[PDB]
Amino acid sequence: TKPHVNVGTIGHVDHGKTTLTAAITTVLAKTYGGAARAFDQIDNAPEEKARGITINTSHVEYDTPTRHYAHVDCPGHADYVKNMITGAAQMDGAILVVAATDGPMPQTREHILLGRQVGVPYIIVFLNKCDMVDDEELLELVEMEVRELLSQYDFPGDDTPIVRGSALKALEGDAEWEAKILELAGFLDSYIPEPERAIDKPFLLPIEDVFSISGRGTVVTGRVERGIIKVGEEVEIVGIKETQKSTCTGVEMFRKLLDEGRAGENVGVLLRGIKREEIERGQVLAKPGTIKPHTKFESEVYILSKDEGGRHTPFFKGYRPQFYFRTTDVTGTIELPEGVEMVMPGDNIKMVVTLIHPIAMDDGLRFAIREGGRTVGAGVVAKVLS
Ligand SMILES: Nc1nc2c(ncn2[C@@H]2O[C@H](COP(=O)(O)OP(=O)(O)O)[C@@H](O)[C@H]2O)c(=O)[nH]1
Ligand SMILES: [Mg+2]
C-alpha cells in the first residue's frame, strides 16, 4: 500500500502544535479524503506506557495523495522529553512549530537539541500565527533566527522548509490559510525521504535464548530486528565477550524449517561450531562488520519520578545502576554533566556511561536503567565513545 511515515509536532508551549495537528487532519481530509480531527480530541491526549514510563501522547493519522502518516502530538514539554528519549514515537521527521508572535523560545531550542541527540533525521518548520503579524521584516527575522538555531544543532537550517501560516485560520476554514497547510503536507511528502525498511537494513537478531539440540548443534532464538539471515551465510556473535564468527546452518519457526529468517519473525537460528557455553545473555547475531561492541557512550536519559515507580531518592556521580540493552542488564558507572552533582527523580540529563561488559550498539539504541530488575530510567545512546 501507501508508504507509512512517522511524524510529529515539536516546539514550545502554546506555539500551536495541537491547532496545527487538527488543521492538518482537517485540511487533508477535505482535500484528499480521510477523517478530520478537532482540536479538543487531540489536545485531550490519552496516557500510554512502555519501557516503564508514562507519557501523554495523541496519535493521529492522515494521508497525502501518496503517503500515510502516523503523527504524534503531546500536551506538555515533559511528554516530549519522555517520548523523544524512549521512542514511544520514533519520528522519521518532525514539524517544528514556532509562533511568529514570539519567535523561538526555550522549548524551541530544547526540542531541537533533543531531536539531534536522539537522531530525529529531518525537521520542517511551520511558522505559525502569521495571521497575528503583518510585518514581513519581522517574519523574515524570525525565520533567520530559526534557521540559525537549527544549524547550531547541526540540522541543515539554510535548506529547511519553512511555511508561514495560521493553524487557527486554517482550522477555521479560511481557504487562503488552508493552502499553507497543503504546502506543509507537500514538504512532509517531498522533504522527508521514504524511511529505510527494517528488511533492507543489515541483519541483526538479539539472542533471547539458546538450546543445545539434536545432533551437535546450538540454536539461538530471537526476533529478527533487521535484514535477513539466509542459510549458508556467516554471522558475527557480538557483545559481552570477544566477537566470534559462525555460520547459519538452519533457520526454523516452530516445526517449519526455513531457508531464511526475515525482519519481524521470531526464529531459531542454527549455528555451526559454536557450543552453548560460548553464548552469553545480551549478545546479538549480526551481519559481519556491521555493528561493533562498545562499553562507553554518551546518552540522554530520563529518570522516572517516584510517582511513576522510579527511585524515591536522588543519585550522584557514584551511581552504578544496571543498563538493560535489548535483553539483559549490564552494570555501568556514570559521569554527570558539567554543573550537575545531584539527579532528582523526574529529571532528564545527558549521561556518559561505561558498562562493565561490551554491548553491540550504534547511536539511537534504546536502553532501560534498572535497579534490582526494576526500571528506574530510560535512555538512548546519543554517541558511542569506545
Ligand atoms: N491567532 C492564532 N492563534 C493560534 C494559532 N494557532 C494556535 N493558536 C492559539 O494558540 C493557543 C495555543 O495553541 P495550541 O495548539 O494549544 O498550542 P500547543 O501548546 O503548541 O499545542 C490556543 O489559543 C490556539 O487557539 C494561529 O495560527 N493564530
Ligand atoms: Mg498542544
**Are 239 and 205 spatial neighbours (Cβ–Cβ below 8 Å)?**
no
Residues 6+ apart with CB under 8 A from 216: none
Please give the positions annotated as active site: 14, 17-18, 77
Which amino acid residue places its CA nearest to atom 11 of ligand 1? 14
> Which residue has 500510554 as its cell numbers?
48
**Could you tell me if the CB of 168 is within 6 A of ligand 1?**
yes
Which amino acid residue places its CA nearest to atom 23 of ligand 1? 14
**Are 207 and 58 spatial neighbours (Cβ–Cβ below 8 Å)?**
no
Residues 6+ apart with CB under 8 A from 206: 222, 223, 225, 284, 326, 327
**Domains of the chain as residue ranges with CATH:** 2-195 (3.40.50.300), 198-292 (2.40.30.10), 293-385 (2.40.30.10)
**Could you tell me if the CB of 326 is within 6 A of ligand 1?**
no
Going by the annotation, the residues of the binding site for GTP are: 11-18, 73-77, 128-131
Largest Cα separation within the chain, whole Å, is: 79
Q: How far apart are alpha carbons 207 and 221 in whole angstroms?
A: 6
Other CB atoms within a 10 A radius of the CB of residue 3 amount to 15
Ligand nearest to the CA of 17: 1
**Are 202 and 286 spatial neighbours (Cβ–Cβ below 8 Å)?**
yes
Q: How far apart are alpha carbons 335 and 318 in whole angstroms?
A: 8
Closest alpha carbon to 23 in 184, 134, 132, 160 = 184
Residues 6+ apart with CB under 8 A from 282: 239, 240, 325, 326, 327, 328, 330, 357, 359
**Could you tell me if the CB of 128 is within 6 A of ligand 1?**
yes
State in Å: Cα 101 to ligand 1 middle.
11
Distance of CA 340 to the CA centre of its chain: 26
State in Å: Cα 18 to ligand 1 middle.
7
Torsion sign across C-alpha atoms 84, 353, 280, 261 = positive
Going by the annotation, the residues of the binding site are: 11-18, 73-77, 128-131
Q: How far apart are alpha carbons 333 and 355 in whole angstroms?
A: 7
**Are 144 and 123 spatial neighbours (Cβ–Cβ below 8 Å)?**
no
Method for this entry: X-ray
* Amino acid letter for position 167: A
Q: What is the resolution of this structure in A?
A: 2.0
**Could you tell me if the CB of 102 is within 6 A of ligand 1?**
no
DSSP strand pairing (234-239 vs 241-253): antiparallel
**Could you tell me if the CB of 105 is within 6 A of ligand 1?**
no
Which amino acid residue places its CA nearest to atom 19 of ligand 1? 14
The three-state (H, E, C) secondary structure of the chain, written as one string: CCCEEEEEEECCCCCCHHHHHHHHHHHHHHHHCCCCCCHHHHHCCCEEEECCEEEECEEEEEECCCCEEEEEECCCHHHHHHHHHCCCCCCCEEEEEEECCCCCCHHHHHHHHHHHHHCCCCEEEEEECCCCCCCHHHHHHHHHHHHHHHHHCCCCHHHCCEEECCHHHHHCCCHHHHHHHHHHHHHHHHHCCCCCCHHHCCCEEECCEEEECCCCCEEEEEECCECEEECCCEEEEEECEEEEEEEEEEEEECCEEECEEECCCEEEEEECCCCHHHCCCCCEEECCCCCEEEEEEEEEEEECCHHHCCCCCCECCCCCCEEEECCEEEEEEEECCCCCCCECCCCEEEEEEEEEEEEEECCCCEEEEEECCEEEEEEEEEEECC
DSSP strand pairing (241-253 vs 328-335): unpaired
Q: How far apart are alpha carbons 149 and 11 in whole angstroms?
A: 13
Which amino acid residue places its CA nearest to atom 9 of ligand 1? 16
State in Å: Cα 304 to ligand 1 middle.
30
Torsion sign across C-alpha atoms 360, 366, 371, 374 = negative
CB-count exposure of residue 66 (10 Å: 0-12, 13-18, 19+)? exposed
